[PDB]
Amino acid sequence: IKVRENEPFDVALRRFKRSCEKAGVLAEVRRREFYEKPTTERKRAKASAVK
Template sequence: MAQIQVRQNESIDSALKRFKKALEQSGILQEYKRHTHYEKPSERRRRQKLKRRKK
Protein backbone atom coordinates (compact mmCIF):
# COMPACT_ATOMS: atom_id res chain seq x y z
CA MET A 1 0.00 0.00 0.00
CA ALA A 2 1.44 3.34 -1.05
CA GLN A 3 1.39 5.95 1.65
CA ILE A 4 2.71 9.49 2.05
CA GLN A 5 2.75 12.02 4.86
CA VAL A 6 1.42 15.47 3.98
CA ARG A 7 4.05 17.98 4.98
CA GLN A 8 3.33 21.15 6.83
CA ASN A 9 2.33 24.00 4.49
CA GLU A 10 2.25 21.60 1.51
CA SER A 11 -0.46 22.11 -1.08
CA ILE A 12 -2.89 19.32 -1.85
CA ASP A 13 -1.73 19.31 -5.48
CA SER A 14 1.88 18.60 -4.61
CA ALA A 15 0.88 15.92 -2.09
CA LEU A 16 -1.31 14.26 -4.71
CA LYS A 17 1.54 14.40 -7.23
CA ARG A 18 3.88 12.67 -4.73
CA PHE A 19 1.19 10.05 -4.01
CA LYS A 20 0.69 9.27 -7.70
CA LYS A 21 4.46 8.93 -8.14
CA ALA A 22 4.60 6.52 -5.19
CA LEU A 23 1.79 4.45 -6.76
CA GLU A 24 3.63 4.24 -10.07
CA GLN A 25 6.90 3.22 -8.43
CA SER A 26 5.24 0.50 -6.37
CA GLY A 27 3.49 -0.96 -9.45
CA ILE A 28 0.00 -0.76 -7.96
CA LEU A 29 -1.45 1.13 -10.94
CA GLN A 30 -0.09 -1.38 -13.45
CA GLU A 31 -1.51 -4.25 -11.42
CA TYR A 32 -4.90 -2.53 -11.21
CA LYS A 33 -5.04 -1.86 -14.94
CA ARG A 34 -4.06 -5.43 -15.70
CA HIS A 35 -6.89 -6.83 -13.56
CA THR A 36 -9.52 -4.31 -14.65
CA HIS A 37 -10.10 -5.58 -18.18
CA TYR A 38 -9.90 -9.03 -19.68
CA GLU A 39 -6.82 -9.54 -21.80
CA LYS A 40 -6.74 -12.23 -24.45
CA PRO A 41 -3.92 -14.76 -24.06
CA SER A 42 -2.41 -13.70 -27.39
CA GLU A 43 -2.32 -10.07 -26.24
CA ARG A 44 -0.72 -11.12 -22.95
CA ARG A 45 2.02 -13.04 -24.77
CA ARG A 46 2.63 -10.09 -27.09
CA ARG A 47 2.91 -7.68 -24.14
CA GLN A 48 5.31 -9.98 -22.29
CA LYS A 49 7.43 -10.42 -25.41
CA LEU A 50 7.73 -6.64 -25.79
CA LYS A 51 8.57 -6.31 -22.10
CA ARG A 52 11.39 -8.84 -22.42
CA ARG A 53 12.69 -7.10 -25.51
CA LYS A 54 12.92 -3.74 -23.70
CA LYS A 55 15.16 -5.18 -20.97
Protein backbone atom coordinates in the same frame (compact mmCIF):
# COMPACT_ATOMS: atom_id res chain seq x y z
CA ILE B 1 1.26 3.19 0.15
CA LYS B 2 1.07 5.74 2.94
CA VAL B 3 2.48 9.23 2.92
CA ARG B 4 2.66 11.74 5.79
CA GLU B 5 4.54 15.03 6.25
CA ASN B 6 5.29 17.64 8.94
CA GLU B 7 4.06 21.25 8.56
CA PRO B 8 6.47 22.17 5.72
CA PHE B 9 4.13 20.73 3.06
CA ASP B 10 2.30 22.34 0.12
CA VAL B 11 1.62 19.83 -2.66
CA ALA B 12 0.48 16.13 -2.71
CA LEU B 13 3.61 15.09 -4.71
CA ARG B 14 2.67 11.44 -4.15
CA ARG B 15 4.35 9.81 -7.18
CA PHE B 16 4.58 6.56 -5.17
CA LYS B 17 1.59 5.45 -7.30
CA ARG B 18 3.31 6.20 -10.60
CA SER B 19 5.78 3.69 -9.15
CA CYS B 20 3.60 0.66 -8.35
CA GLU B 21 -0.22 0.37 -8.57
CA LYS B 22 -2.26 2.86 -10.54
CA ALA B 23 -1.13 2.97 -14.17
CA GLY B 24 -0.55 -0.64 -15.09
CA VAL B 25 -1.52 -3.05 -12.39
CA LEU B 26 -5.20 -2.18 -12.06
CA ALA B 27 -5.82 -1.49 -15.78
CA GLU B 28 -4.30 -4.96 -16.45
CA VAL B 29 -6.77 -6.84 -14.19
CA ARG B 30 -9.88 -5.33 -15.82
CA ARG B 31 -10.08 -7.86 -18.70
CA ARG B 32 -9.72 -11.52 -19.76
CA GLU B 33 -7.81 -14.50 -18.56
CA PHE B 34 -5.94 -15.73 -21.79
CA TYR B 35 -2.62 -17.43 -21.29
CA GLU B 36 -2.23 -16.69 -25.01
CA LYS B 37 -2.26 -12.96 -25.67
CA PRO B 38 0.25 -12.41 -22.74
CA THR B 39 2.70 -14.89 -24.20
CA THR B 40 2.65 -12.88 -27.46
CA GLU B 41 2.36 -9.45 -25.83
CA ARG B 42 5.44 -10.32 -23.75
CA LYS B 43 7.08 -11.90 -26.77
CA ARG B 44 6.74 -8.69 -28.81
CA ALA B 45 7.49 -6.51 -25.80
CA LYS B 46 10.83 -8.31 -25.33
CA ALA B 47 11.30 -8.42 -29.13
CA SER B 48 10.68 -4.64 -29.30
CA ALA B 49 13.20 -3.94 -26.50
CA VAL B 50 16.17 -4.12 -28.91
CA LYS B 51 18.79 -1.72 -30.37
